[PDB]
Amino acid sequence: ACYCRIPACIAGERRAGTCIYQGRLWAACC
């Protein structure tokens, strides 16, 4: 499904939203 990443989603993935954990924001990548 969607995988959390920083700083950005990678080739093939579309950024759908945001994840929050360990005190920070991440890209939610689908």
Query: Closest approach of Cβ 12 to a copy of itself, in Å?
Result: 16
Contact 30, 12 (CB under 8 A): no
Q: Is 13 in the site for a copy of itself (CB under 8 A)?
A: no
Q: Is 8 in the site for a copy of itself (CB under 8 A)?
A: no
Q: Is 5 in the site for a copy of itself (CB under 8 A)?
A: yes
Query: Closest approach of Cβ 18 to a copy of itself, in Å?
Result: 5
Q: Distance between CA 7 and CA 15 in Å, rounded?
A: 11
**Could you identify the residue written with the tokens 């689908």?**
30
